[PDB]
Symmetry: D2
Subunit: 57 residues, 4 copies
DNA sequence: GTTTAAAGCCGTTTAA
DNA sequence: TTAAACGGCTTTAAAC
DNA sequence: GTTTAAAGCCGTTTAA
DNA sequence: TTAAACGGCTTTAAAC
DNA sequence: GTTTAAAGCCGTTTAA
DNA sequence: TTAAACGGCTTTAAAC
DNA sequence: GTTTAAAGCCGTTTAA
DNA sequence: TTAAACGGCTTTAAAC
């Protein structure tokens, strides 16, 4: 499964909050991103829609 | 706040699951991504750590 | 805000997974329950509905 | 799996926000509650701890 | 001094 | 047209 | 929380 | 031309 | 032995 | 009609 | 990823 | 009686 996140920007934002990022952290976030998207598609379908809206996530 | 998402890849993945993406869907996903990261940093800090782990998300 | 969770059953389930429950853990879970419900009501409303469905959470 | 939710209080809270509750809504919320708890126990374990904290959820 | 792991730089190449 | 990834190298830190 | 039964809504289709 | 029926769903109440 | 915090019991009372 | 909360008491464990 | 412009869909309302 | 217009939304493509 392809990375859906911009690693550099995630690391830069986390650094901005005063934290380092583990070697495998971004991979972990990517996995949570996929689950959010999959949950959203179940909500889209439940509302008899073909188009994912911000409200579905 | 910068986009943390690869828009093209998210739209392509959603399309692969048989769905269209609204004009404002990606912005909505971005907002949820930020909340997940902010939740994670509270977890990192609660564990007296300076480094975000995949388990924190 | 009232407790929406059955504390005894939460502690018993967590114990069944081989874990103890902190003095303030249940309060923390209650807070996450409220956020889930509030997110769901935003989804219900976005779908022009008056009735919360399982799919909204 | 036992209900972890106080149904009456959830229905009353949702009603307070101006919404009805579907016949199967509470069951749906229960399922999300279990996933939150299971996520938390993975976080507890990742922190080499035996006791679930509010921060783990 | 050692180990472990994370940051920071630099240059090149797709990818977005 | 532009930035993000990437992979090698060195730095840096913590703790023993 | 449960059961039982009645009300109240909504949308469609005859029936009056 | 119009309202009454109807059937599914949720609410509500009482009492244990 | 001490401290800190969590479990486990018991009995009563609403609450669900 | 039933179980969950609750508050006091003792146990238990970890680490110093 | 961005911009520009064209296609394709869907639902409603005249127009032919 | 029927289809063409129309206007919003998303997709798609090309090239930089």
């Amino acid at each position: 499964k392809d990375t859906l996140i911009v690693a550099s920007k995630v690391k830069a934002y986390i650094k901005s909050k005063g934290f380092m990022t583990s070697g495998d952290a971004v991979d972990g976030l990517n996995e949570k991103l996929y689950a959010l998207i999959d949950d959203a598609l179940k909500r889209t379908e439940s509302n008899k829609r073909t188009t994912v809206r911000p409200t579905d996530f």
